[model samples]
Target: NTFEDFYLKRELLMGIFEAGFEKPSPIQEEAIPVAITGRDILARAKNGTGKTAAFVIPTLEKVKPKLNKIQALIMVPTRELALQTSQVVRTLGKHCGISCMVTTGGTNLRDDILRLNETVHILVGTPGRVLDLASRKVADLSDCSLFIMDEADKMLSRDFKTIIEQILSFLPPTHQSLLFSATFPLTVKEFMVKHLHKPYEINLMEELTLKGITQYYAFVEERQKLHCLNTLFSKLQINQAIIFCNSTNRVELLAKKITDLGYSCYYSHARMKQQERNKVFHEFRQGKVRTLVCSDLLTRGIDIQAVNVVINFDFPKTAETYLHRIGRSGRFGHLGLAINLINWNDRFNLYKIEQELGTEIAAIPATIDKSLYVAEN
Candidate 1:
């Protein structure tokens, strides 16, 4: 019922209630109890469902603040997520006196080195940055026994797996690993078998098809793609939308075109300055912008619940990529819409993804039912 049921430290309870959480969410109800018992976990739940608190609460509860060593290490795939997560740790562990630090590659390495001088109870960062510190012995983890990875699917990708594995070498052999995400690839099972010690598995999402999302594809000429997007903009009931382009250049170009057409838009990509990227991400999530145009870089682990529509300006190459792109909408069982702009070159990719996801995408109709996506108050 209440966070008090967990028998959490009095200080932690204060932080939880003060943070405006009255009762445990579904994931928290399932995860916090098992995590407190000291075991590995592989948890999957829908987006924006309090998955963050489920893990953060247990991490805060188990860590010994007075130990003066980094007691918990939370690895996320992106720098933006690392920053967001460390803030959650700080918020929930405020009165508990846990010193939480966020380290990522884009920031000044020397600043992170200096921060390591003080006691850090929880260390949250991207794998590459964490691996750098661990390998250099600037961030000691021999005694850090709690290991948690958010966006576990992305964390286990080839680009990050090597560094994540290397970082694990610095942790104690007895460390408890917690892997959390909305979607799990086949590769996750292999990793779990090799690394996780009889993990307690939790799956709250029963189907691969996201609930309440109406998927559609607009077959259009590449030349007329912008025109099609304009038509959809004028037609659909959109609260906020994220349009995904497949390349950095396209992301910027589409954003510019949308703005030139007098539509409010913001763009973000891996190539942008970190400050600019952060501001774009922040403002979009704050609903200051009606639309965000970006590449797959914003696909995973970034949840904006207000986004009721997702436009794949360019269809993704892989099925997993398609899933993550459309997942930008339809969060937490809310009604949402996914519209893909498919041109000649993207035809096969679209069909392949449909086969892979075991679902068929319909052609966009002249008029869409507002009841299919518009959330009723």
Candidate 2:
């Protein structure tokens, strides 16, 4: 249905219209009605599926702007996601007179605490620091009713699980809990039932791969991977692309190597200072940088509509990792491409991914045509 048809607040409708949210996505259509009815939701939708807004809109709809307290909480796995999702909250609530704040670490705590001093309607943050703030009484969450856990599967990581539970304890017991993840493994299934009780589910999970993305792998020796990338740069109609590596060290070194080869690129990873990462992210979005080389930092929730090609310079650790990496390319239903550089030893891992996903990832033919992969936009 058109966004105009939703029974949203006039302010929310205006804000959504201003933000150019043209229509209710499938997830939005299924989840929004249930959410407006105030049922706890345990939804499962893939990346680029408008899942964020599905929860963000509902959580924001219940927030009372006149209450000088934070009313909704969003927890993500990484700092970049916190920033990105918080931006969504701010953008969607711009005309609603709503106040939102992102409180992730690696920044000044004094500033975060200071920001919390004012009224904040929605709060998005990483688990550790968000829990710390609530524990210290710096960010009072007693009034928080809408509790959203994005990337819910990742929150069960060894680093996050304990802290996530700790963070949950601070929220009022009656708060509405909404959890989401691309994959709900058996490992995390126990935690799901333990926390969100009788959750009204709208399950739409599927294989990690996208049908719109043309996937291919180039068999190359360890040394030939660079040459393969260079060849593709000259051969393909790369409007914009992301090159993924497994390590920050590789990302830094490769960005330099690529730049030395006379191609403009931007690099980002967790190690670099936050200010620089912010700059790189902004410039890449503006198309000033046609290529970006980074680690898994760019893999998950941050959406860049212009990305059409993803190069796995270093094979991801697993098929799940591969899914998130390539998912960046075919975002918002634009046709895209993913090229993987596979070494002899890594071919077995490649086969495992193919078997698990139930899709045949083709080998790049000796003859190549860029027209087969470029988006139509």
Candidate 3:
């Protein structure tokens, strides 16, 4: 009844079917209808629950070519996100006759300007580039009626907020604005009062941490971290796992160490060539590799549904970071596991995360020689 309910543009319905989407994801379930009504949205949902499609679907649904203007504007925090979300618009909008374009830093702005000179029904881009183009009058959104801010949590942080404010200034008050985040900083309370119009808050903030995940921690001295990880490998059956480190250097070192252990492992960090990074990402996502060691670069907006476990080799700096790490597992309503390797000094950070999440994180059992360490796997 999901796609059946929309009865949207003929091409849109065809695209949805072609994309193999028979039912709406939880975020899409709540967001799409409300968005169709033209209400401003301040919503939160956990990662990997299809939030991209939530906003993309509505943004496309509202394209009124009869208005003969750019009808949708989506601002994302990163270049990867800008391009990925635009793919959603392209795939879902299909032959709906909605012309969409993507622009981010490091791309040819002249080419983007050329694209803008032609008809563009939807625009997806990073805030910095989008604002720059808007400032240069290379692209204008005066007629856009759907304004979407994805990765809303990251976009509202220190530097982004300033640019977001200026971006907000460029949008007409007549547009319907949708803000979606996985972890809503309580300060977002400030944004609603400032920008939303008769907005309704959808509070799934606490759900940032998924329920199907089993969380555990292993205590180790900083130097003993490698040995502790080896112990877990011998103990659990990991179909797919993401090993998260605090820094790119750490991620690289850990991947090498894990690879030396005779296991199939790959690394992803900001320093890698984008071509190689994409290769690693797809290999891991397709289960070609059993383990991925990465910086938090894979944490927030990226989606990998087969992730069976997330190993935090270094405890996160903040509660939001902790949530994002674990949230990688248990994605899309699937059961998964999150294990932490906590250095002796990092327990204080772990304690703070426990308190923030309001749950006691049980430590890994001393005797993983048996099955106690494994989740319902």
Candidate 4:
């Protein structure tokens, strides 16, 4: 059925039109109909595939405005994602007079409590803060009927399983659940088998990589890599790009060094507080910062649409990691470039990535002198 015939309320349809959504994306078109029927859904679509609105619209439609309590819950992995999803909910539900609140870490708990005192129909938050609020009895989920676990694969990573399980245990047993992720690993399968019952599965890009990204690698000495990156940025005239490092320390160091060289750049890693990271992402999305130096934290949930170039300052630890980094660019079928700067230390990892993905990534010519960079250091 066409989106127009999907039978959304008039006010909600107006909100979709106001948001400039002419038609539904592939995942949206496929999943929304099933979701609006109050069925449990398991969808697998890559990042930037309009998955947020697919479930959000259905959640808002099911919300009972007179309830005055939490009717829907969305758990995200990062504060940035929490805020983004909250904004999406507010924009789409504004015309319907539905209210959504965001609760995340590194914010004033007292303020969150004050907001919770008012009517909130939808609540979006990170796992830690959500559990904290629930423990404190400030956030109510007793009446919540719909539960969404966005970026479920990222949430199932080694670091987040405990918090996620704790939060799940707190929820009511009979709620409808929706789990969406870029990739469905074995962990996701296990979670579905244990928690979700007879859920409809949607896998949009299970066998395909990104559509419009041109992937290449540049082999250079560790010292000349930075200079090579600068040269490519200049030659390609890329105004906005994401430079990925492997560690928080490297992200900070690269961001500082790059900014000192007279470039507009920002960095985000797990070490930074949530509010600080949110500010960095805000500036980057608004074009106040032209480039971002970050770690794998950005390889998952956060979505920024205007990025046209992606640079790997450090080789990814796995093939999935590499795909996430490259996936940041070439979104929405736009032509994009992904350049990986590999040093001698990365040869083994690069070979493994190529073997796993079953494609040889071509090497690019280096324009910098190999010996001049070692001498300076």
Order of candidate numbers by TM-score, starting with the best? 3, 1, 2, 4
TM-scores of all candidate predictions against the true structure? 0.57, 0.57, 0.57, 0.56
For model 2, residues 17-43, the per-residue Cα lDDT tens digits are 787776555567668888888888887
Q: Which ten residues in a row have the lowest lDDT in candidate 1?
A: 296-305
Model 4, global lDDT: 0.77
Query: Candidate 2: misplaced stretches above 4 Å?
Result: 204-377
Model 3, 212-291: lDDT tens digits are: 66778988888889998898887677777888899999998888888888989889877764335545665677688888
Give the number of the best model, judged by lDDT: 1
Query: Which prediction has more favorable lDDT, 2 or 3?
Result: 2
In model 1, which runs have C-alpha deviations exceeding 4 angstroms?
Answer: 204-377
> In candidate 4, which residue ranges exceed 4 Å CA deviation?
204-377
Segments in model 3 whose C-alpha atoms lie over 4 Å from true places: 205-377
Query: Which ten-residue region of model 3 has the weakest summed lDDT?
Result: 368-377
Clashes of 3: 0
Residue 215 of model 2 has an lDDT of 85
Give per-model CA RMSD. Answer: 9.3, 9.6, 8.6, 11.2
Give the Cα error of residue 72 in candidate 4, in Å.
Answer: 0.5
